[PDB]
Ligand binder design. Structure first.
Ligand SMILES: CCCCCCCCCCCCCCCCCC(=O)OC[C@H](COP(=O)([O-])OCC(O)COP(=O)([O-])OC[C@@H](COC(=O)CCCCCCCCCCCCCCCCC)OC(=O)CCCCCCCCCCCCCCCCC)OC(=O)CCCCCCCCCCCCCCCCC
Ligand code: BCL
Ligand SMILES: CC[C@H]1c2cc3[nH]c4c(c3C)C(=O)[C@H](C(=O)OC)c4c3nc(cc4[nH]c(cc(n2)[C@@H]1C)c(C(C)=O)c4C)[C@@H](C)[C@@H]3CCC(=O)OC/C=C(\C)CCC[C@H](C)CCC[C@H](C)CCCC(C)C
Ligand SMILES: CC[C@H]1c2cc3[nH]c4c(c3C)C(=O)[C@H](C(=O)OC)c4c3nc(cc4[nH]c(cc(n2)[C@@H]1C)c(C(C)=O)c4C)[C@@H](C)[C@@H]3CCC(=O)OC/C=C(\C)CCC[C@H](C)CCC[C@H](C)CCCC(C)C
Ligand SMILES: COC1=C(OC)C(=O)C(C/C=C(\C)CC/C=C(\C)CC/C=C(\C)CC/C=C(\C)CC/C=C(\C)CC/C=C(\C)CC/C=C(\C)CC/C=C(\C)CC/C=C(\C)CCC=C(C)C)=C(C)C1=O
Ligand SMILES: CCCCCC/C=C\CCCCCCCCCC(=O)O[C@H](COC(=O)CCCCCCCCCCCCCCC)COP(=O)(O)OC[C@@H](O)CO
Ligand SMILES: CCCCCC/C=C\CCCCCCCCCC(=O)O[C@H](COC(=O)CCCCCCCCCCCCCCC)COP(=O)(O)OC[C@@H](O)CO
Ligand SMILES: CC(C)=CCC/C(C)=C/C=C/C(C)=C/C=C/C(C)=C/C=C/C=C(C)/C=C/C=C(\C)CC/C=C(\C)CCC=C(C)C
Ligand SMILES: CC(C)=CCC/C(C)=C/C=C/C(C)=C/C=C/C(C)=C/C=C\C=C(C)\C=C\C=C(/C)CC/C=C(\C)CCC=C(C)C
Ligand SMILES: CCCCCCCCCCCCO[C@@H]1O[C@H](CO)[C@@H](O[C@H]2O[C@H](CO)[C@@H](O)[C@H](O)[C@H]2O)[C@H](O)[C@H]1O
Ligand SMILES: CCCCCCCCCCCCO[C@@H]1O[C@H](CO)[C@@H](O[C@H]2O[C@H](CO)[C@@H](O)[C@H](O)[C@H]2O)[C@H](O)[C@H]1O
Ligand SMILES: CCCCCCCCCCCC[N+](C)(C)[O-]
Ligand SMILES: [Fe+3]
Lengths: 54, 48, 43, 306, 281, 54, 54, 54, 43, 42, 54, 53, 44, 42, 51, 42, 38
């Protein structure tokens, strides 16, 4: 709990930050793509049907 | 004939025989092929 | 222990800055999720 | 009989080589793995050490997620039945969206969305690996021949999966992720566009693949034939030509009237290999976009009887 | 021419046939018994191809085709206008290829090097003879061989492949394609690695084999070595050609159906034959 | 149970944490995707049908 | 009987533990997937039928 | 935080700047491509329909 | 057992912090499972 | 032995491994009991 | 009968134990799969028919 | 007698490994062949005897 | 040490100042572009 | 003569192996009795 | 015929003889099992009305 | 000998291997008799 | 290989072969009694 900082004792900060950024970016893109795949959450299609567009 | 070559011919003969016998036992040529291939590969990998 | 050669104070300062970054990211994410749930609840 | 220098007679083992330092970040280089006698009968027995950097981490995670997406789609397609998974492993497929979706990202997960997710993962993995091949050569002070030879294969990969589907206006034009299904895609691609034999760049790609097999059989046989004079040490023969390089040159000069050098043979090699995918990408990019029937095209261009 | 180092290597001997009767050079080329034989066979074959073009009625190089005898002739001779010219040209091609290999053996003996190159060429000759001699003889007709045309032998490839549905499903075809692809990949990697070691970033010193080993260990975690890569190339090419010859020698002789149906043996294995679900359930 | 700590005297903490993180993420993604492929537990489709969206 | 503690004298704890973890996880995953593919033990489908969720 | 400036004491500026340039370029191209692939947000087709140009 | 050059007290400390993280993760997972079960029981 | 571990080291390592094994087996027993009561397979 | 221990003087304990463990696991899996294939001994279908779960 | 001279030509390790592989393969083959014939398929005989199917 | 890259605290702080100036410029232009697109054709 | 194990070491190792084999066999016998009482195959 | 052991290696001779003799025996047994006339399991099944 | 074993070692190896063979044959004969009374094949 | 070694090996191999044939003849005779082949 109040002792976590010691990750930085055993893990190189550069490796941890690079891996974390890679993971966050990939996960965010995956979630956005899943949302675009679902017809009920594709915001572009939702707004097209809401405003009577092509 | 070298020891490895003799091991190779023995592996081929064992492969054929075990393949026939286990194709008969398991009721399919693939079972015999698997058993014979594994046995021959193990036999050929261990020469003098 | 130690493998990357950081002192106690250095590790504490780095953890403080990383935690600040994590809290800003999480606060933005919480605001975004609240906005989406108000717009279209998924439950 | 006579030793043909194809399998080693004696294996010798010493301390594992940790590699050159140069300008490589040694903290990102792992430890040496085990020694493989089975591999040592043919080449080097030592496994590792490997370099794992930022681009390495990105490439591994992206490729792992690509494989994971394809595999979990396969497991869903099997009904989570391991026996069905093994029975139909070569029959599973992650297919692109249907043609009515065009290039849009609105295709459902089971009807094209999951293929798009896997394709994004593969895109990131392959381009990260290209950057890795560039940077690993840069760290050692080497020329970037590997990176630009990999770019030739990346060109065909991009045309097959990204560029030609965009130019054709649909993701359905792209290749499915499956064993038998991408073979089916290849056959149907040839059938839809007339005859891909009559694509001149398909013919050039086949000529360069055949020539790669030709040239690298010739080169391997030549180096094994002069390995008794230390011909496999090609860098030292470039720096200080010995009788191995001279005999290798004279064999081919007396055989076919011209020869190469110990350096320029590898220029021949790199170009013959890269031209395969270099011509293949152009041949695929011209299919459907410029020529829809390659047999009629060959008829109009003097390649087939009218 | 002569290379600056050529003169000390041009010595008598190393000839299988002919002794000193043909032991000389024409320009850079070495002539022997088999060099003279190669010239005769190649010249006769090319001239007969030109005569076949005269008989066919076209001078377009891409439209010239020398066709084998019809299936009605079986394995017998055919009229020169129909398939006899093809048979003579095939004999000339076989003579030229075998004499080329034997001339290479003579040159190897003269230079005191190994016979790896003629041995590797014998694999290509065997694949050619599989396509023109062994498979047609097994099948019973010279008309199962391919014609000698730039684009009509592709027609033969397409027709033979589609006789058995999609030919991708031939398993030895799959293995041979894997070997061909792996060989092209290895050739690219080997050329690139040697060139990158010999041609570093400008102003830098030549790199050593240590740097090559280090670079592929950094990249993929394994390096096969300077000897290993050339052995690997020889075996990849020879394996690709061997499995090509095998997939064609089994096709139409022990397999007569669509190659896609062959794979149903794995699907119809008794333990998972009838489990519902998946693709085949 | 009060003596598990010496597992850290056998295994490298960095290797253990990297492998554990990769394994846990893959397991979580697998479970979430299995739930999505289940018609009665796809929360996106459940909310689409509940709110009459698609 | 109570002399099994010598097993670690012969076998490296690292390899034994890694192999045991991999084997146990793979066996558990296979058993879970067999149960899921079984229509009579698919707990998600059982709950869906029980609660009329489709 | 007011102490983010030490991220530059950990990471090489050249690598960070190159990574940002590549990431931003690819993100922008990806978003523009998705918008073009969406018929309701393809501005060329919207203008063609609005001004009656086809 | 000295396989990684790690002292006994350092092992105790690292295990204490690792288990603190493990129990935080497990408590969050228990709350999530409870919420899902109340929303849609799977038994 | 091959590993070079002392006798007391083997004692302690096996004690801890067995404690973990017993915890895993106890959890497995409880899970199997719950499943069998819920939906028996015999 | 009272001299079998000398097997250990000829066979290395590591290889013997690994081989025996692999053989035991494979034999057990084979017998379990054989019982599962026979409809009269498939315990899952036996319980499904007993309790009318399908 | 004097068969012990067989341990003068072959390595006992190889002899024992080969003989164990041989015996296991032979036993598996015979059991599988017995399962193949309905006359000696004890699972099927039990199913028929107890009317389990 | 004080860092891995070899930058003084003052060098790093100056570089971060210039970086944040560039980031704020890019973000202001992006905000204006998003506002213009939303007014022209909203997606919510 | 290849592993170098002494007489006492070999006897100890075989004694532990035998203890394990008897434990495994006892568990298997109990399981077989349970299965036979459930569904005899004779 | 004692010169074989100074002409042919005893290891190879014994190995080849064992392999070939075992293969011959199993092939003979399987040929017998193939033919219904001498298939002893089938003979017993017919005699005791097992099937 | 080619294997390098002494006379006594070969004698002892054959003795113990023969004892194991006799044990295996005893178990096999008991099993075959059990099967024969259960279902004779002759 | 020594002449004495070859002679002893031939002796033991012939003894094994004679035992093998003694078993084989009894088996063949028992099978013929059970079911003659002609
Ligand atoms: C593409 C972008 C450029 C990539 C290459 C960059 C480079 O210089 O790398 C040199 C590279 C690395 O060297 P380095 O580390 O930078 O320098 C180390 C030292 O300086 C030492 O360097 P070096 O001495 O080892 O090599 C210097 C190199 C420098 O020159 C090059 O690398 C030239 C590369 C040309 C690429 C052409 C690609 C397109 C080809 C088809 C065109 C249409 C048909 O010279 C060559 O390799 C000679 C190349 C051939 C020259 C003859 C060209 C004849 C043209 C005739 C027509 C015009 C008249 O060395 C190589 O030899 C690489 C060759 C293999 C890769 C070639 C490109 C493959 C395809 C790319 C992807 C596909 C793109 C789309 C194609 C289809 C479009 C429709
Ligand atoms: C009916 C079948 C069709 C046919 C339709 C096709 C189609 C369609 C195509 C070809 C193409 C090719 N065909 Mg064709 N082809 C036919 C018949 C033939 C015949 C013959 C004797 O009949 C020959 C020898 C060929 C041969 C070939 C090659 C010359 C060429 C493939 C190049 C290559 O290496 O791609 C292999 C290399 C790649 C695909 C690039 C790989 C690079 C990427 C980056 C790899 C990433 C790896 C990934 C990350 C996985 C990682 C895994 C882990 C590392 C383990 N064709 C006919 C008429 N053919 C291709 C071409 O380009 O020609 C125009 C092509 O697109
Ligand atoms: C010139 C054209 C030819 C060519 C060239 C070529 N290919 C190349 C190169 C070159 C010059 C490289 O430099 C590059 C390379 O790295 O070569 C070794 C490469 C390469 N060509 C490859 C493949 C390839 N090339 C092909 C073809 C060709 N390549 C052409 C014939 C083909 C075909 C014919 O289909 C294939 C399949 C790769 C081996 C490599 C590029 C690898 C790459 O990008 O990998 C990315 C990773 C993935 C997408 C998948 C990862 C899957 C893993 C399961 C991830 C997870 C791993 C896990 C985390 C491990 C954990 C371990 C611990 C638990 C112990
Ligand atoms: C076996 C591995 C690969 C391989 C290896 C290989 N090839 C080799 C060698 C080796 C080791 C040589 O040493 C030898 C050589 O010297 O190369 C420069 C050779 C060689 N491989 C060649 C070609 C070649 N190899 C091919 C393939 C392969 N070669 C394999 C993939 C192909 C393909 C796939 O199409 C071709 C075209 C030559 C460059 C050369 C042999 C030259 C030769 O035989 O010279 C004497 C003969 C002539 C000068 C020509 C005779 C012409 C005939 C009389 C008439 C025409 C007949 C022909 C059949 C018509 C074809 C019509 C249509 C089908 C187009
Ligand atoms: C590292 O080492 C190495 C070298 O360098 C030391 C080398 O050079 C080479 C050789 C490789 C190259 C030079 C690369 C280029 C080669 C190819 C691209 C292969 C394809 C080659 C061709 C298409 C050329 C074809 C030429 C032929 C077949 C020769 C023509 C032959 C004749 C016209 C007839 C010959 C017969 C004669 C002369 C008999 C004479 C009798 C009378 C005149 C009567 C290799 C492999 C090598 O590994
Ligand atoms: C018995 C054997 C035949 C008889 C002996 C023949 C010997 C030598 C003749 C060689 C003939 C080569 C012909 C090259 C033609 C180049 C011109 C060209 O590029 O032709 C193009 C198509 O050819 C194409 O794919 C050509 C490309 C082919 C595929 C690639 C093959 C590459 C092989 C070498 C690679 C190095 C189309 O161009 P057009 O404007 O319609 O041309 C019209 C004329 O062809 C007449 O109608
Ligand atoms: C990473 C993804 C792995 C998921 C598997 C999840 C279960 C793992 C259980 C491990 C239990 C012990 C914890 C541990 O050990 O943590 C890690 C386990 O890694 C490992 O599973 C490495 C395993 C390699 C294969 C991973 C995939 C296994 C399943 C597919 C197999 C086909 C680290 O191990 P190391 O110290 O690097 O090993 C070093 C080796 O030299 C030992 O011989
Ligand atoms: C150095 C010191 C002092 C200390 C170090 C600290 C240490 C060591 C810490 C480690 C503590 C921990 C967590 C230990 C954990 C141990 C565990 C979980 C052990 C678990 C064992 C489980 C076992 C065997 C299970 C075996 C099961 C088997 C065959 C099953 C076989 C099944 C078959 C054949 C399938 C049959 C059915 C079908 C095919 C459908
Ligand atoms: C047991 C477990 C757990 C797992 C098992 C895992 C298994 C079985 C995996 C099986 C994997 C298999 C079969 C893979 C077969 C693959 C094959 C043949 C591929 C052939 C060709 C592929 C090509 C050209 C792909 C090209 C793609 C390209 C250029 C780029 C695409 C990019 C896009 C479309 C991005 C789109 C998204 C955004 C813009 C956000
Ligand atoms: C090493 C190569 C692969 C192994 C060698 C395979 C050679 C071919 C098999 C030779 C032995 C005969 O093997 C036998 O063939 C028949 C052919 O329907 C199949 O046997 C099947 O039909 C036969 C009757 O014909 C039934 O009695 C049997 O219950 C059933 O399984 C199996 O394949 C196998 O029982
Ligand atoms: C490099 C990437 C960025 C540049 C890409 C250039 C092409 C981008 C798309 C161009 C137009 C695509 O065409 C679009 O496809 C959609 C797919 O639902 C179709 O929608 C109907 C329409 O035909 C059109 O709106
Ligand atoms: C030396 C260790 C370098 C990487 C350390 C990163 C912290 C642990 C990351 C675990 C999770 C891995 N992943 C890929 C799922 O993000
Ligand atoms: Fe080379």
């Amino acid at each position: 709990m109040s002792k976590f900082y010691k990750i930085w004792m055993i893990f190189d900060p550069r490796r941890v930050f690079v891996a974390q950024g890679v993971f966050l970016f990939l996960l965010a893109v995956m979630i956005h793509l899943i949302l675009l795949s679902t017809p009920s959450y594709n915001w572009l299609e939702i707004s097209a049907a809401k405003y009577n567009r092509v | 004939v070298s020891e490895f070559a003799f091991r190779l011919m023995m592996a081929a003969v064992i492969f054929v025989g075990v393949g026939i016998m286990f194709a008969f036992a398991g009721g399919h040529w693939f079972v015999g092929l698997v058993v014979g291939g594994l046995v021959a590969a193990f036999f050929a990998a261990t020469p003098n | 222990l130690g493998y990357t050669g950081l002192t106690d104070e250095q590790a504490q300062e780095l953890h403080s800055v990383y935690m600040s970054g994590l809290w800003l990211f999480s606060a933005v994410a919480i605001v975004a999720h609240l906005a989406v749930y108000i717009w279209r609840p998924w439950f | 009989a006579e030793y043909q220098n194809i399998f080693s007679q004696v294996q010798v083992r010493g301390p594992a080589d940790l590699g050159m330092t140069e300008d490589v970040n040694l903290a990102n280089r792992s430890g040496v793995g085990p020694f493989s006698t089975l591999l040592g009968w043919f080449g080097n027995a030592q496994l590792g050490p490997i370099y794992l950097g930022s681009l390495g981490v990105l490439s591994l995670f992206s490729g792992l997620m690509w494989f994971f997406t394809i595999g979990i789609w396969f497991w869903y397609q099997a009904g989570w039945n391991p026996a069905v998974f093994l029975r139909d492993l070569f029959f599973f497929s992650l297919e692109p969206p249907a043609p009515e979706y065009g290039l849009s990202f609105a295709a459902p997960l089971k009807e094209g969305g999951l293929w798009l997710i896997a394709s994004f993962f593969m895109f990131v993995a392959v381009w990260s690996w290209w950057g890795r091949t560039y940077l690993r050569a840069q760290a050692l002070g080497m020329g970037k021949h590997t990176a630009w030879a990999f770019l030739s294969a990346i060109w065909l990969w991009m045309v097959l999966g990204f560029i030609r589907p965009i130019l054709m206006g649909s993701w359905s034009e792209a290749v499915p992720y499956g064993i038998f299904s991408h073979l089916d895609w290849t056959n149907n691609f040839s059938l839809v566009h007339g005859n891909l034999f009559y694509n001149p760049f398909h013919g050039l790609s086949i000529a360069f693949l055949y020539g790669s097999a030709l040239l690298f059989a010739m080169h391997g046989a030549t180096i094994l034939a002069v390995s008794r004079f230390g011909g496999e040490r090609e860098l030292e023969q470039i720096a200080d030509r010995g009788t191995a390089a001279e005999r290798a040159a004279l064999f081919w000069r007396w055989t076919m009237g011209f020869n190469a050098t110990m350096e320029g043979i590898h220029r021949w090699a790199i170009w013959m290999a890269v031209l395969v995918t270099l011509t293949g990408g152009i041949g695929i990019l011209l299919s459907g976009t410029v020529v829809d029937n390659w047999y009629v095209w060959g008829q109009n261009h003097g390649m087939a009887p009218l | 021419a002569l290379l600056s180092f050529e003169q000390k290597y041009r010595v008598p001997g190393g000839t299988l046939v002919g002794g000193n009767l043909f032991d000389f050079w024409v320009g850079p080329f070495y002539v022997g018994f088999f060099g003279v034989a190669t010239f005769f066979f190649a010249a006769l074959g090319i001239i007969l191809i030109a005569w076949s073009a005269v008989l066919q009625g076209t001078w377009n190089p891409q439209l010239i085709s020398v066709y084998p005898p019809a299936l009605e002739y079986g394995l017998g001779g055919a009229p020169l206008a129909k398939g006899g010219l093809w048979q003579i040209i095939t004999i000339c091609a076989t003579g030229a290829f075998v004499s080329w290999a034997l001339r290479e053996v003579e040159i190897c003996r003269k230079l005191g090097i190994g016979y790896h190159i003629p041995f590797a060429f014998a694999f290509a000759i065997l694949a050619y003879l599989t396509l023109v001699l062994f498979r047609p003889v097994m099948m019973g007709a010279w008309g199962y061989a391919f014609p000698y045309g730039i684009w009509t032998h592709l027609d033969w490839v397409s027709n033979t492949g589609y006789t058995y549905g999609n030919f991708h499903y031939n398993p030895a075809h799959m293995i041979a394609i894997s070997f061909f692809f792996t060989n092209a990949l290895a050739l690219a990697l080997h050329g690139a690695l040697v060139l990158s070691a010999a041609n570093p970033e400008k102003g830098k010193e030549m790199r050593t084999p240590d740097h090559e080993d280090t670079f592929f260990r950094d990249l993929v975690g394994y390096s096969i070595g300077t000897l290993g890569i050339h052995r690997l190339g020889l075996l990849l090419s020879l394996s690709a050609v061997f499995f090509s010859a095998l997939c064609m020698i089994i096709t139409g002789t022990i397999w007569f159906d669509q190659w896609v149906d062959w794979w149903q043996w794995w699907v119809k294995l008794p333990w998972w034959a009838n489990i519902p679900g998946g693709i085949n359930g």
